[PDB]
Amino acid sequence: RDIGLRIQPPAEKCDDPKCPWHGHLKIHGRVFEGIVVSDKPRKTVTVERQYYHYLKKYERYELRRSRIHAHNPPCINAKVGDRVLIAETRPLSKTKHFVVVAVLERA
Amino acid sequence: ATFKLVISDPKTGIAKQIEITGPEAEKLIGKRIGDQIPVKELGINLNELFGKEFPEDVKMEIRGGTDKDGFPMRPDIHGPRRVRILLSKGPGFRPKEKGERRKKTVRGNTISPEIVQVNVKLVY
Amino acid sequence: MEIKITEVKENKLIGRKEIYFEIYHPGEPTPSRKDVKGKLVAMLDLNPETTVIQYIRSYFGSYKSKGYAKYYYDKDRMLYIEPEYILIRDGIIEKK
Amino acid sequence: ARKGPKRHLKRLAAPTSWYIERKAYKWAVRPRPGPHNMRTSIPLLYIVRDYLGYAKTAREARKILNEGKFLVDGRVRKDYKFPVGIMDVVSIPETGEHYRVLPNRIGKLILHPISEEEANIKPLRIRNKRMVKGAKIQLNFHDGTNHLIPLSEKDNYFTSYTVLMKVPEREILEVLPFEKGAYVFVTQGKNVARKGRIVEIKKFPMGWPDVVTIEDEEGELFDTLKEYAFVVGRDKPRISLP
RNA sequence: ACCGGCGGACGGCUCAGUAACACGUCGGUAACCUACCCUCGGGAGGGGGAUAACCCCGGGAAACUGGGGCUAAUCCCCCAUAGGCCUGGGGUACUGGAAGGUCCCCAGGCCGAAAGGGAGCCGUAAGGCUCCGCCCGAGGAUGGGCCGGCGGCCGAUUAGGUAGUUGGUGGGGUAACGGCCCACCAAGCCGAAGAUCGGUACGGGCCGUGAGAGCGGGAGCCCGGAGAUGGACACUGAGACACGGGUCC
Ligand SMILES: [Mg+2]
Ligand SMILES: [Mg+2]
Ligand SMILES: [Mg+2]
Ligand SMILES: [Mg+2]
Ligand SMILES: [Mg+2]
Ligand SMILES: [Mg+2]
Ligand SMILES: [Mg+2]
Ligand SMILES: [Mg+2]
Ligand SMILES: [Mg+2]
Ligand SMILES: [Mg+2]
Ligand SMILES: [Mg+2]
Ligand SMILES: [Mg+2]
Ligand SMILES: [Zn+2]
């Protein structure tokens, strides 16, 4: 099945209605890549991405990091340390607005 | 207690005002809105007021009134007390604007010595 | 004064003709509306009752003035279209 | 807008495609909702007063409109707020002239004179297409209008095709497909008002819009958005364009 | 003059509050509302009702306000049909990157339209011929709601902070997604790359100065936000918890 990403679907199926592969959730907007740095809450992960910001006065760079909370479907079940792809969705909780759609490199 | 009477004849559209005081006005102290009372018992030369023959044992019913300060009476409020309530229609409030609500001072159901005007209509 | 016609345009939707003109007059005052109208109606064969002068304008250091006028084929159309102030200012009608 | 819809428009905030003197007055006409959108149309008062010059003031422009002297796509229009947009035909029968509304090389709206015969047709790009009750097809065009076709015809119309329509009768007479070798006229963007032929079509994931490569007459290739490319012919234009 | 319709939520004024998704910018709504306007497809059958104005009599110092009589509508209320919404079982006609969406057929329910009204001529009359209008459905347009990433102050003589707090499951409520609010189950969430707390302040386009790198400001015009003596809360309406409308302290 395709959801417009162009990536392979997960190995097995799930019953989560909040899953974009086997449920009714839709993805639309930005797609980010990052690293998991926390997986304690049920079906929730924290994803961190690094980037450089340019300081015009000092003509030099500094490193900044972006942290995003995302929903973790049971068929994927990402864990701390691996690379993930996440896609934007409709509000799911107070802080959750993305869903994990693929593990790129297991830790 | 002095009552100023407004007698309305529904079969003609004509009304007459007389003043009644003394022992006659004492009986009328205590009746609500919507109850009848014979005019012969109340005591009135009815045939003289309108210049018309009337059937015997005729009677009248209390329809409304105004108090000494100029506030009117409300059929839906019980007792003789005076209140200040929020209104959207009905006696004691002319809206002038869609959905307008205003707080007004109104009177009660039972007749009281403070009441001045009494409006009644003849029931044959 | 010497009058030169610059443009004559036809406006069928309104029912009029619109006339732009110049007046050359070194050493003279700005010409009056009456004189300009008389010269214009002689120069174009117009009924003067339906000839309205929109404006006459002089400039800072010039010997000439520029002017704009309109001519209606029908009096009632003129009374229906034109504002009251311009017809009074041109002496076509009387101020109440 | 603290509590309700806006009904006014300052001259300084007017759309950039109008030919209007932006500092001469405080207010501009706020156009009425209608066929096109705000970025691709202009109120009719500016056509009567500012563009053509048939009236000097708004008051006598309104008297001209109320008598029924101006036709838009073959229909009488009296509202001075009526929006007039891309590919419309403006007709004045008492003077016998006709124009097509088209964007400039700089993106501003202008009037292009045309023949009386060509004034009977309006090209309409197919913006959307849907099923409707009774199992029929509704076509939704770029100017906001709609048409119905039977289920047997469903393979002859797709989005981005152009339909030549006879106005004001609203009768179909030709369907022009969107494919390689078709003739297109650009309506928005940096390459606005350029025209040519289709060379290639490209698509992307996750809802990013698709892009087209176009060869012009002098042999140069340029790209634009697919939805900015308005089909006007097979290999020659079917309408007169500057 | 009154009943009735539309407008009075725009426009105008100020910068108190606010360090926040308030503002700038790129995207999203397949999670939403929209009177006036545009196109297309259809509809306008049968009944009932009061009341202002007007006449009789009035009250109150006034602001205001009472009883009886009588009357019309594009005013109001019913019946029918069309239509709308929820759930269960099938079929696969459409758009799209992708269907909890659209379309077709059965089944159990609930809600439920309309003004053929007005004006002018040809009408002996009968009836046409125009103009302005009424209701439903599909789409657009216009005006908004909600969400995300990124960007822009000072203080450590403020170091730990949070307990509907962070996430999950089942519901309610909303135009709509959501700890927005509940019931139940876990221990999460933020922080020396400066949390929390305190100080000051409406944000931007821009403006002053300087060779430039920079430094300082952001009243006047335009776009966005907020407020109507302070603090709370409602009615009507497509849109307000309303500066020249209502309620309490
Ligand atoms: Mg899209
Ligand atoms: Mg107001
Ligand atoms: Mg306001
Ligand atoms: Mg603070
Ligand atoms: Mg934001
Ligand atoms: Mg921030
Ligand atoms: Mg019904
Ligand atoms: Mg729910
Ligand atoms: Mg301040
Ligand atoms: Mg500042
Ligand atoms: Mg000032
Ligand atoms: Mg004050
Ligand atoms: Zn799954």
- Complete DSSP assignment for D161-195: -EEEEETTTTEEEEEE--STT-EEEE-SSTTTT-E
Helix ranges restricted to H, chain D: 44-45, 58-66
Question: What's the sign of the alpha-carbon dihedral A21, A26, A29, A35?
Answer: negative
Question: Please, which experimental method was used?
Answer: cryo-EM
Query: 3-class SS at D227?
Result: helix
Tell me the sheet residues that pair with D100: D89, D112
C-alpha to C-alpha distance for B40 and B46, rounded to whole angstroms = 9
Domain that residue B66 falls in = 1-124
Query: 3-class SS at B104?
Result: strand
Tell me the sheet residues that pair with B62: B120
Residue list, CB under 5 A from ion ligand 1: D 207
Tell me the sheet residues that pair with A44: A71
User: Phi/psi of residue A27, each to 5°?
Assistant: -115, 140
Which positions ≥6 away from B12 have C-beta within 8 Å?
B50
Cα D193 → chain centroid: 13
C-alpha to C-alpha distance for D168 and A107, rounded to whole angstroms = 68
Q: Per-residue b/e over A63-80, b at no fewer than 16 CB within 10 Å?
A: eeeeebbbbbbebbebee
Q: DSSP letter at D233?
A: E
- Complete DSSP assignment for C3-33: EEEEEEEEETTTTEEEEEEEEE-TTSPPPPH
The C1' atom of E18 and the CA atom of D21 lie apart, in whole Å, by 39
Count Cβ atoms below 10 Å from residue D131 Cβ, excluding itself.
11
Question: What's the sign of the alpha-carbon dihedral D3, D9, D11, D15?
Answer: positive
The C1' atom of E54 and the CA atom of B14 lie apart, in whole Å, by 15
Ramachandran quadrant class, D167 (left: phi over 0; alpha: psi -120 to 50; beta: rest): beta
Q: What angle do CA A84, A86, A91 make, to 5 degrees?
A: 145
Element (H, E) at C79: helix C75-81
- Chains touching B by CB (3 or more pairs below 8 Å): none
Domain ranges for chain C:
1-96
Cα D201 → chain centroid: 24
Query: 3-class SS at D13?
Result: helix
* Closest to B91 measured CA to CA, from B56, B114, B63, B52: B63
Q: Which long-range contacts (C-beta less than 8 Å, at least 24 apart) are formed by A1-5?
A: A3/A27, A3/A101, A4/D205, A4/D206, A4/D207, A5/A31, A5/A85, A5/A87, A5/A101, A5/A102, A5/D205, A5/D206
Query: 3-class SS at D66?
Result: helix
Interface size, chain C vs chain D, as Cβ–Cβ contacts under 8 Å:
15
Residues constituting chain B: 124
D159 nearest nucleotide via C1' and CA: E95
- Complete DSSP assignment for A41-67: STTEEEEEEEEEEEETTTTEEEEEEEE
Which positions ≥6 away from D158 have C-beta within 8 Å?
D126, D129, D177, D178
A5 with D206: Cβ contact below 8 A: yes
Where chain D is broken, by preceding residue (C–N > 2.5 Å)? none
Count Cβ atoms below 10 Å from residue C34 Cβ, excluding itself.
11
Cα D145 → chain centroid: 12
C-alpha to C-alpha distance for A73 and B89, rounded to whole angstroms = 59
Residue whose entry in the numeric block shows the structure tokens 């006879």:
D166
Which positions ≥6 away from C79 have C-beta within 8 Å?
C87
- Complete DSSP assignment for A81-105: T-EEEEEE-S--SSS--EEEEEEEE
The answer, yes or no, to whether B and D have at least 3 beta-carbon pairs within 8 Å is no
* Resolution value (Å, 1 decimal): 2.2
In the chain, the amino acid numbered C36 is V
Ramachandran quadrant class, A98 (left: phi over 0; alpha: psi -120 to 50; beta: rest): beta
Tokens of A12: 């097995």
The answer, yes or no, to whether C and D have at least 3 beta-carbon pairs within 8 Å is yes
- Quote the minimal CA–CA distance from A46 to chain D in Å: 23
* Closest to C16 measured CA to CA, from C68, C57, C56: C68
D3 nearest nucleotide via C1' and CA: E9
C-alpha to C-alpha distance for A32 and D114, rounded to whole angstroms = 52
Q: DSSP letter at D46?
A: I
Q: What angle do CA B12, B13, B16 make, to 5 degrees?
A: 100
D207 with A31: Cβ contact below 8 A: no
Count Cβ atoms below 10 Å from residue D206 Cβ, excluding itself.
15
- Chains touching D by CB (3 or more pairs below 8 Å): A, C
Q: Maximum CA pair distance of chain A?
A: 54
| Contact residues, chain A, for D207 at CB < 8 Å | 4, 28
How many angstroms does the Cα of residue D25 sit away from the middle of ligand 11? Answer: 22
| Contact residues, chain D, for A5 at CB < 8 Å | 205-206
Closest alpha carbon within chain C to D48: C13
Residue whose entry in the numeric block shows the structure tokens 């008297």:
D63
Tokens of D176: 């022009």
Tell me the CA distances in angstroms from C67 to C15, C31, C42, C91, D56, one per residue in order. Answer: 20, 11, 16, 17, 16
| Contact residues, chain D, for C81 at CB < 8 Å | 60, 63
Q: How large is the C-alpha radius of gyration of chain A?
A: 15
B116 nearest nucleotide via C1' and CA: E59
Q: How many domains does chain B have?
A: 1
Tokens of B55: 């059937």
Asked whether the beta carbons of C57 and C37 are under 8 A apart, the reply is no
Cα D36 → chain centroid: 7
